[PDB]
Amino acid sequence: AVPFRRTSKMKKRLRRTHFKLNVPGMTECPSCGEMKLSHRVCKACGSYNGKDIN
């Protein structure tokens, strides 16, 4: 499969419309106050669901 002719400039700008990556799902940690991903252990204090995992 060899290309007939080269791709235009706006035809490759349109193809990368759905190529973006999206913001993570993050909430605030109730202990330290930093942000952290939902349903995951905070990587700063080490606490999940009130208790401590350290």
Partner 1 sequence: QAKAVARTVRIAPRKARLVMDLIRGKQVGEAVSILNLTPRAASPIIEKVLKSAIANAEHNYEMDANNLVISQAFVDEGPTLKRFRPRAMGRASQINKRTSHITIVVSEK
Partner 2 sequence: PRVKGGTVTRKRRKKVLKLAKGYFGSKHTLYKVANQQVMKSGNYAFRDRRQKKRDFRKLWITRINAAARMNGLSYSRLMHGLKLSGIEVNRKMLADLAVNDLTAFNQLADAAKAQLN
Partner RNA sequence: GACCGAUAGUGAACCAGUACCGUGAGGGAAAGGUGAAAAGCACCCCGGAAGGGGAGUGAAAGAGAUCCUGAAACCGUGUGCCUACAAGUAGUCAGAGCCCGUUAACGGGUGAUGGCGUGCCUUUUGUAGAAUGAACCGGCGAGUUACGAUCUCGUGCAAGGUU
Partner RNA sequence: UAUCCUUGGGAGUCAGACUGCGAGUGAUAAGAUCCGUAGUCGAAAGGGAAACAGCCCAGACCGCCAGCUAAGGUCCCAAAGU
Partner RNA sequence: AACAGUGGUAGGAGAGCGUUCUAAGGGCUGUGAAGCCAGACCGGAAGGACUGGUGGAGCGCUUAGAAGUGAGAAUGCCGGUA
Q: Which two tokens stand for residue 18?
A: 């759905």
- Interface residue with partner 1 among 12, 15, 32, 35 (CB under 8 A) is 35
In the bound state with RNA, the residue whose beta carbon lies nearer, of 20 and 39, is 20
Q: Which two tokens stand for residue 3?
A: 């290309």
CA dist 7 and 48 (Å) reads: 51
Binding to partner 2, residues 6-35 (CB under 8 A)? 8-10
Of 12, 14, 44, the C-alpha closest to 30 is: 44
* 1 lies in the site for partner 1, by CB under 8 A: no
Q: Which residues bind partner 2 (CB under 8 A)?
A: 8-10
